[PDB]
Amino acid sequence: PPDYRISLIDIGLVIEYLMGGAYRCNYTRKRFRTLYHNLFEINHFPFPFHELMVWAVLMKRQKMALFFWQHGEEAMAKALVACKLCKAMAHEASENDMVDDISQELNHNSRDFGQLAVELLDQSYKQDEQLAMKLLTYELKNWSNATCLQLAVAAKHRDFIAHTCSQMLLTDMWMGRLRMRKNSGLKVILGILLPPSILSLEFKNK
Amino acid sequence: QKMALFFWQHGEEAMAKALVACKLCKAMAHEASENDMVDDISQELNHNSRDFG
Amino acid sequence: LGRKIYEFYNAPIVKFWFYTLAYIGYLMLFNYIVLVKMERWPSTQEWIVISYIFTLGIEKMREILMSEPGKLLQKVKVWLQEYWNVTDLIAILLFSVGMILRLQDQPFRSDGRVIYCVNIIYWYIRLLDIFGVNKYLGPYVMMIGKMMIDMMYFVIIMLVVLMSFGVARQAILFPNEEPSWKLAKNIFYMPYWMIYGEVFADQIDPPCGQNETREDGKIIQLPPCKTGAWIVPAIMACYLLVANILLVNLLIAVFNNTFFEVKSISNQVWKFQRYQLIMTFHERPVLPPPLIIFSHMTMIFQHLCCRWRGLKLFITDDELKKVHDFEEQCIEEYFREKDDRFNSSNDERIRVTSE
Amino acid sequence: MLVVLMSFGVARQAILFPNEEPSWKLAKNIFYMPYWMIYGEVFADQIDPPCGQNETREDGKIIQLPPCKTGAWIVPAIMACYLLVANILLVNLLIAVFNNTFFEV
Amino acid sequence: QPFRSDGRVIYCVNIIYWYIRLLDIFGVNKYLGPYVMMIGKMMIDMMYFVII
Amino acid sequence: GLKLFITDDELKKVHDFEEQCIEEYFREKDDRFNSSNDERIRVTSE
Ligand SMILES: CC(C)CCC[C@@H](C)[C@H]1CC[C@H]2[C@@H]3CC=C4C[C@@H](OC(=O)CCC(=O)O)CC[C@]4(C)[C@H]3CC[C@]12C
Numbered sequence: 062p063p064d065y066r067i068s069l070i071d072i073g074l075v076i077e078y079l080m081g082g083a084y085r086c087n088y089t090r091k092r093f094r095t096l097y098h099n100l101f102e103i104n105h106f107p108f109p110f111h112e113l114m115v116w117a118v119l120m121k122r123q124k125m126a127l128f129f130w131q132h133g134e135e136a137m138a139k140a141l142v143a144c145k146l147c148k149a150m151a152h153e154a155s156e157n158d159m160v161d162d163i164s165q166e167l168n169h170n171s172r173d174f175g176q177l178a179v180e181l182l183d184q185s186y187k188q189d190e191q192l193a194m195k196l197l198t199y200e201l202k203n204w205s206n207a208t209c210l211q212l213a214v215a216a217k218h219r220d221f222i223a224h225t226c227s228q229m230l231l232t233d234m235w236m237g238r239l240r241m242r243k244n245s246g247l248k249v250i251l252g253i254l255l256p257p258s259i260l261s262l263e264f265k266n267k
Numbered sequence: 268q269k270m271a272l273f274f275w276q277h278g279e280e281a282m283a284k285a286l287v288a289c290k291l292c293k294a295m296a297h298e299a300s301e302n303d304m305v306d307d308i309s310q311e312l313n314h315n316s317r318d319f320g
Numbered sequence: 321l322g323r324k325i326y327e328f329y330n331a332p333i334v335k336f337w338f339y340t341l342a343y344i345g346y347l348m349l350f351n352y353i354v355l356v357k358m359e360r361w362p363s364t365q366e367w368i369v370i371s372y373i374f375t376l377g378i379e380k381m382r383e384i385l386m387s388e389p390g391k392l393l394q395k396v397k398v399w400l401q402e403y404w405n406v407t408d409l410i411a412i413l414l415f416s417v418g419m420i421l422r423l424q425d426q427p428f429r430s431d432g433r434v435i436y437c438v439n440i441i442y443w444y445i446r447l448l449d450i451f452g453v454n455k456y457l458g459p460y461v462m463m464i465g466k467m468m469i470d471m472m473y474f475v476i477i478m479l480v481v482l483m484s485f486g487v488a489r490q491a492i493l494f495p496n497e498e499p500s501w502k503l504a505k506n507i508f509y510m511p512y513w514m515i516y517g518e519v520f521a522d523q524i525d526p527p528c529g530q531n532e533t534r535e536d537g538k539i540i541q542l543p544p545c546k547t548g549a550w551i552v553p554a555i556m557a558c559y560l561l562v563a564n565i566l567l568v569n570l571l572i573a574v575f576n577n578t579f580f581e582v583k584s585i586s587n588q589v590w591k592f593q594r595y596q597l598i599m600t601f602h603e604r605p606v607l608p609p610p611l612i613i614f615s616h617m618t619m620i621f622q623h624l625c626c627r628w629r630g631l632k633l634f635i636t637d638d639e640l641k642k643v644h645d646f647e648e649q650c651i652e653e654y655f656r657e658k659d660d661r662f663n664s665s666n667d668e669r670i671r672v673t674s675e
Numbered sequence: 676m677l678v679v680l681m682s683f684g685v686a687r688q689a690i691l692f693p694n695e696e697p698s699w700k701l702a703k704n705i706f707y708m709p710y711w712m713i714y715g716e717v718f719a720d721q722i723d724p725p726c727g728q729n730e731t732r733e734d735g736k737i738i739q740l741p742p743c744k745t746g747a748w749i750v751p752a753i754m755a756c757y758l759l760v761a762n763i764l765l766v767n768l769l770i771a772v773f774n775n776t777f778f779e780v
Numbered sequence: 781q782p783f784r785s786d787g788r789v790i791y792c793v794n795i796i797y798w799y800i801r802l803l804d805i806f807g808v809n810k811y812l813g814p815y816v817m818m819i820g821k822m823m824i825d826m827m828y829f830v831i832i
Numbered sequence: 833g834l835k836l837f838i839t840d841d842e843l844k845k846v847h848d849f850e851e852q853c854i855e856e857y858f859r860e861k862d863d864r865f866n867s868s869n870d871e872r873i874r875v876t877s878e
Pocket residue numbers: 341342345346364365610
């Protein structure tokens with residue numbers, strides 16, 4: 062078919078395909094589907110720059126994507142979302158093996174957006190520790206109630222999680238509430254074996 | 268660090284002071300890696316030890 | 321003290337070390353049952369091993385039920401992305417097949433023994449997988465996964481050259497055998513071990529057509545040279561040289577440059593897979609596989625008694641506003657720093673001086 | 676190597692030998708035969724023996740050899756896999772490792 | 781006889797050649813073809829090793 | 833096979849496209865040479 066009047070539902074499924082995992086977008090949601098079924102400020106997004114840069118990444122308009130990344134909020138989440146969308150489009154273009162320069166520049170766009178997320182994490186790290194922590198761990202009400210670290214590990218961004226902020230977070234989560242931290246492996250086998258040994262093990266106060 | 272370089276500028280026995288500060292910085296870097304804190308301060312203590320050496 | 325032991329047992333590092341100690345104990349239990357007599361009824365050690373396998377299968381079915389996608393066909397797909405998971409399911413099904421063969425009488429009990437041996441094989445690799453927690457061993461496992469493709473290409477080219485020489489040797493020395501399936505074994509048996517040491521010095525260039533001396537001085541009439549069988553030592557020499565020297569040292573060079581590729585990554589992919597290890601060992605219940613039945617019954621009782629009748633930190637609106645304002649300050653600082661670095665570069669200074 | 680080698684050792688010791696009591700010689704049999712495979716000799720007499728067949732002796736007498744106790748054609752195949760993977764893969768891996776560490780030193 | 785056995789020898793060396801020609805045919809792959817090229821490059825170093 | 837026959841007018845279009853391409857390439861080469869650092873340093877020194 063000509064497929065004129067492409068619905069926002071259909072490109073929503075394209076984000077379902079491209080993002081992967083369990084990324085439930087707002088378009089795929091039945092709550093938005095009843096509104097879209099109704100109209101064959103109600104039809105006004107609270108965050109226009111999000112879907113504008115989603116449109117820009119989907120149609121390959123790179124400079125518009127950077128400009129929409131400049132404005133609005135949740136720049137980190139937007140950067141990782143655009144990075145995984147660009148990488149997934151590059152993988153689909155290599156799988157369909159079209160003209161190879163567009164697969165090259167989709168991979169280049171994915172590297173650019175991932176690099177932008179990296180420097181942004183570095184600047185947040187140099188600015189404030191706990192604020193960057195809360196930025197890296199808070200819930201993402203506009204993107205499937207995920208978190209930015211989940212979008213990073215979906216995006217396969219090895220350099221983002223190789224940063225010391227995420228490594229510090231994974232180290233904190235690794236020990237959990239226990240904070241003895243002196244020759245950890247030998248002390249934990251002395252903790253499980255001979256179970257009365259954790260009385261000399263110090264813990265985080267609430 | 269910059270106060271350390273400035274105090275290294277003045278006074279006598281600059282060589283001895285340089286090697287003493289180098290081993291103090293390297294030992295602090297080893298202790299900070301052994302306690303494995305935020306890794307950038309272990310990196311810049313190693314950098315300070317390399318600078319003084 | 322009770323909250324202290326709850327905090328200690330709920331940590332992911334303690335849960336991981338508990339899991340790997342239980343896995344090592346299970347593996348040594350497997351070894352002990354596979355090395356000793358298995359009678360008409362299974363022993364206590366075999367009961368521990370089947371209990372481990374069945375509870376591990378129930379745990380995997382539980383993680384299937386408690387996955388993040390809501391569509392049930394999508395859960396098995398997102399679990400089939402991981403290769404370890406599907407090979408774990410394959411081995412659990414193989415153990416079930418071997419148990420149902422072993423619990424019968426002869427001759428199926430020996431077939432259960434074969435299945436038990438190939439299951440050791442798999443669980444020793446899975447122990448190799450479990451070792452990937454180390455910041456040095458994990459990169460080594462990654463590199464082994466990278467070199468498996470070059471191994472497969474070596475397998476193809478060796479296969480061509482080796483069974484070429486095998487067909488020639490099997491058809492020069494042996495012109496007088498009927499069609500039978502032992503011909504393929506003779507093709508693939510003698511030329512394979514030539515690469516790895518022993519060259520079968522007794523079985524090559526035998527003196528034919530000559531009354532060679534026996535032990536007690538009696539010249540026994542040896543069978544004659546059936547064909548011109550001086551060809552097979554020469555093509556033996558050519559095959560051994562070309563195979564060993566050429567392709568082994570080729571794969572040495574291949575492994576060298578692929579190690580050059582993967583050493584520049586090194587710890588970064590380890591830090592990448594650290595998150596996946598974190599999430600798997602935080603989602604997992606506190607008790608290990610042998611005793612995960614206790615956790616399953618207490619979670620069934622909790623979710624059908626008090627309910628049927630991780631890194632995601634929740635953030636209020638004002639703290640979201642503070643986080644957002646911090647974010648805008650950060651991106652604006654970053655762009656000011658980028659512009660200042662670009663204006664402080666040498667080429668920009670040269671260009672503006674020329675203008 | 677220890678993991679891969681004694682994996683093959685447990686399999687070979689439990690396929691060919693299903694009829695021995697608990698004794699400490701089982702560990703020596705696990706660690707003895709697979710270790711020397713890396714370094715030359717591959718024990719060509721002790722692998723794939725003709726079982727279940729009246730093989731000829733020295734003085735033309737077909738002696739009744741012991742039968743194949745289990746499906747013991749498995750152990751040459753996993754022998755081939757172990758020898759290939761062990762020797763080729765990990766030796767040349769450590770060759771590359773020694774090359775870049777020599778570049779460091 | 782005895783020329784039929786000589787035909788058998790010629791048939792065996794012809795297997796040898798047609799297995800290499802199969803190696804040649806494998807060069808269509810974007811990974812195997814470079815490997816065949818490299819083997820052709822290393823044959824000269826093989827010849828120098830053969831001499832020494 | 834790959835040898836595609838081409839009429840006179842399409843040959844003229846292909847030729848004109850070719851001259852436009854080589855002239856663009858040489859303009860781009862000259863602009864890159866004048867935008868290099870060493871040329872800027874030399875002309876600043878003069
Ligand atoms: C799951 C991992 C962490 C292993 C944990 C160790 C224990 C839970 C198990 C492992 C091996 C078991 C032993 C294996 C064999 C025997 C012999 C068994 O004795 C007999 O079978 C003969 C006498 C009889 O029939 O009672 C008595 C139990 C015992 C000591 C078992 C007791 C419980 C042990 C120590």
